Structure 1
Amino acid sequence: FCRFTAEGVQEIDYKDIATLKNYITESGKIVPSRITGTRAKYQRQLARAIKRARYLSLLPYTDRHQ
């Protein structure tokens, strides 16, 4: 039950942080595709976006760090 297929997005945006926050953990972790049911193709790019965000301090790498 992938969201991206239904929406039909061409590419995930690291800027769209809210969308990302759905797929990250409370501890900051990227959520597996088993749990989210994201499509594989879409999962990879999602991870890529998350990491780009993390570099940009839009998302945190982890909950603890400061």
Structure 2
Amino acid sequence: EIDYKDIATLKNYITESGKIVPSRITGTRAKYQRQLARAIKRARYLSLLP
């Protein structure tokens, strides 16, 4: 349902330095976690984020 391009729901899952927030404090179902992390990693390497 959710992919990398929509930068909206990524800033809430990140810190200032660009570290992906652990699912231990978010609540993510552990499938959306893998896809979400792939999204942040793609965006960082696509350089929306550091």
Aligned length: 50
Give, in whole Å, the separation in 1 of the partners of 2:2 and 2:37.
Answer: 9
Q: Whose RCO is larger (CA < 8 A, sep 6+)?
A: 2
Q: Stretches of 4+ moved more than 4 A in 1?
A: none
- Identity level (%): 100
Structure 1 unaligned spans of 5+: 1-10, 61-66
Q: Which protein shows a greater Rg?
A: 1
Aligned-residue CA RMSD (Å): 1.0
Contact 1:13 1:49 in 2 (8 A): yes
Superposition TM-score, scaled by structure 2 size: 0.87
Counterpart for residue 29 of structure 2: 39
Superposition TM-score, scaled by structure 1 size: 0.69
